[PDB]
């Protein structure tokens, strides 16, 4: 039927976000201890790295989202929910997937933070070419501009402070990461349980044959089509797995902020759960990709 619970509730809906920031802060700060700045400028100065990946999600992924719209003949609400997901920048949770993939972790940031600063300038003007007949009003104001900067900077701080630890005393990296492995696993329990308390109950309605089909094949095409254009275009073979996991993976916590404001919530219904469900299959597709390229070593 409906989505009974109301969102933005202090008891549980805030615990999904006020704890996720704590979850992301330490994780990426811990992730920040595997990058050397002295070769970061090498990635930036010669743009052969990000160019294939940045184009792979600002000139290719919107096509994948838009093609699935017209081909599947989805209504102009879900045909726009998956298009907004397509234009979304490189996911802050994608940088995790480069670590397990043995990819070039230094090039992950150069296409995560640099491809999010383009979301400010592309997406507002990337919708006029893709919402010409899917939405009547303008999307200029609906985009959460102040919700990206407070998201990029919250990501940028562990990006730099994560390596700065190697400047004063890295002896205290032992004193930090030895507990980070111990401690951050407690947060994931709080993150996963509370989600099943508030939004997980009404998930059963959200599934739809023409909605799971897009949410299942779109993270997959983003993965594969991001890789072939990466490795085959003369880029390093071992570095290609960094681009592949960045093209397919992209944030969807930014799409939900648009649907809340773009148009009324009774039209949405439990379509609020698509970005939550999209990441589940986005995560699920990768966790099948992790093993396969961990098989090639063995």
């Amino acid at each position: 039927f409906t989505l009974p619970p109301n969102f933005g509730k202090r008891p549980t809906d805030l615990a999904l976000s006020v704890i996720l920031v704590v979850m992301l802060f330490i994780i990426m700060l811990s992730l920040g201890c595997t990058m050397e700045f002295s070769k970061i400028k090498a990635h930036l100065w010669k743009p052969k790295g990000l160019a294939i990946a940045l184009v792979a999600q600002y000139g290719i992924m919107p096509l994948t989202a838009f093609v699935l719209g017209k081909v599947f003949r989805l209504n102009n609400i879900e045909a726009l929910a998956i298009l907004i997901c397509g234009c979304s920048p490189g996911g802050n949770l994608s940088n995790i997937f480069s670590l397990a993939m043995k990819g070039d972790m230094n090039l992950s940031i150069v296409m995560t933070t640099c491809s999010t600063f383009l979301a400010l300038g592309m997406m507002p003007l990337l919708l006029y070419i893709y919402s010409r007949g899917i939405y009547d009003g303008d999307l200029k104001d609906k985009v959460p501009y102040k919700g990206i900067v407070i998201s990029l900077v919250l990501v940028l701080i562990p990006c730099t402070i994560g390596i700065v630890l190697k400047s004063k005393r890295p002896q205290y990296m032992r004193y930090v990461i030895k507990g980070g492995m111990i401690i951050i696993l407690l947060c994931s329990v709080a993150v996963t349980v509370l989600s099943a308390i508030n939004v997980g109950k009404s998930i059963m309605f959200a599934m739809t044959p023409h909605l799971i089909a897009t949410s299942s094949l779109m993270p997959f095409i983003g993965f594969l089509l991001g890789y072939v254009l990466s490795a085959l275009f003369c880029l390093n073979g071992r570095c290609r797995r960094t681009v592949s996991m960045e093209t397919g993976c992209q944030n969807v916590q930014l799409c939900s902020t648009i649907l809340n404001v773009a148009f009324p919530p009774e039209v949405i219904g439990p379509l609020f759960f698509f970005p939550l469900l999209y990441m589940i299959f986005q995560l699920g597709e990768g966790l099948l990709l992790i093993a396969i390229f961990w098989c090639y070593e063995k």
């Epitope: 039927f1 209504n75 773009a262 039209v267």
Partner: nanobody
Framework: SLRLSCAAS???????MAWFRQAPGKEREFVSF????????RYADSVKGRFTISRDNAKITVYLQMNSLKPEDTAVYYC???????????????????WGQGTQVTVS
């Protein structure tokens, strides 16, 4: 108690369909709403308990079952459909891109 159907005359994909009512010599007032993919519904103030709007999975018809009709409900009901998404109030008629032929309900 009479139930009235609204069938789309062409194969079109609408994300929500609602019913409106134009009182004799009066502005059209909101009556009922239903989501299309899902079952979200939002009846008007007076009609909260009385009427009931329901779709069918198989066909594309929309129904509005009425019960306990009041003699103030005599008006001309105007089925409405919403094709393209936009920011507009449910109660407001600006959200709906397609309208209906129109039918008149009279009671005593």
């Amino acid at each position: 108690s009479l139930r009235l159907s609204c069938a789309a005359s062409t194969n079109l994909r609408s994300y929500a369909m609602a019913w409106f009512r134009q009182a004799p010599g009066k502005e059209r007032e909101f009556v009922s709403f239903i989501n299309w993919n899902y079952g979200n519904t939002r009846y008007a103030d007076s009609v909260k308990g009385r009427f009931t709007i329901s779709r069918d999975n198989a066909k594309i018809t929309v129904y509005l079952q009425m019960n306990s009709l009041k003699p103030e409900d005599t008006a001309v009901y105007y089925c409405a459909a919403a094709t393209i998404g936009r920011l507009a109030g449910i109660d407001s008629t600006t959200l709906y891109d397609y309208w209906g032929q129109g039918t008149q309900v009279t009671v005593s």
